[PDB]
Amino acid sequence: IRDDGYRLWGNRTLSSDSKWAFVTRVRTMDLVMDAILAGHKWAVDRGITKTYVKDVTEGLRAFMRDLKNQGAVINFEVYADPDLNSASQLAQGKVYWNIRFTDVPPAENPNFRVEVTDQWLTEVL
Amino acid sequence: MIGMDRRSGLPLSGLAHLKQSVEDILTTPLGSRRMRPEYGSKLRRMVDMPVSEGWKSAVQAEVARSLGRWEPRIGLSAVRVVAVVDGRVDLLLSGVFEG
């Protein structure tokens, strides 16, 4: 936009889907997971105990509360998937969680509604 | 002192001459008179300037100069903005009478 290569101006990816428009939502979904999958090099090929699901879904929350602390996300919820987790899925190593969160929308359009009134003209007396 | 009116030529003396004596000071710019260059006001220079709170104190300080030169029978008291319409500010020129 500005003089001699002064700014960049794009918020939105080339996306036909309206959900994944902004660059921030595509980056946040791709960069909160490697911030989790690193820090969870464990919880794979370990061995499923009784409180195996509980001890990592309290570790997914603890590695997400610091993301709320540094302003990466707005309020989240992390919980184990109750109906997809079953005894037949444990025999093949499949376990499921729900890491439904939200993200900060970039303020691409700050609107300033402005007029010139004559209200404080009695201040000039 | 008995002078004549500007319009209609009638000789008026007491206090109507006092008011037109002031309005010959305020509306003549400096140097407009012939062979009298230090006569008049800088109020035409203050025309079409924004009405700030320093514009008010610069008009009080300039009416007091220009009336102090050629109007000794008027002691200036205050100049106050009393209304504002679009462009038209209006000033209550108040002053006691001497002489």
From TrEMBL, chain A:
Family to which this protein belongs: Belongs to the myoviridae tail sheath protein family.
Protein name, UniProt field: Probable bacteriophage protein
Taxonomic path: Bacteria, Pseudomonadati, Pseudomonadota, Gammaproteobacteria, Pseudomonadales
Start and end residues of each Tail sheath protein C-terminal domain: 15-117
UniProt signal peptide: none
UniProtKB/TrEMBL annotation, chain B:
InterPro entries: IraD/Gp25-like
SUPFAM superfamilies: gpW/gp25-like
IraD/Gp25-like domain sequence ranges: 14-82
Protein name: Probable bacteriophage protein
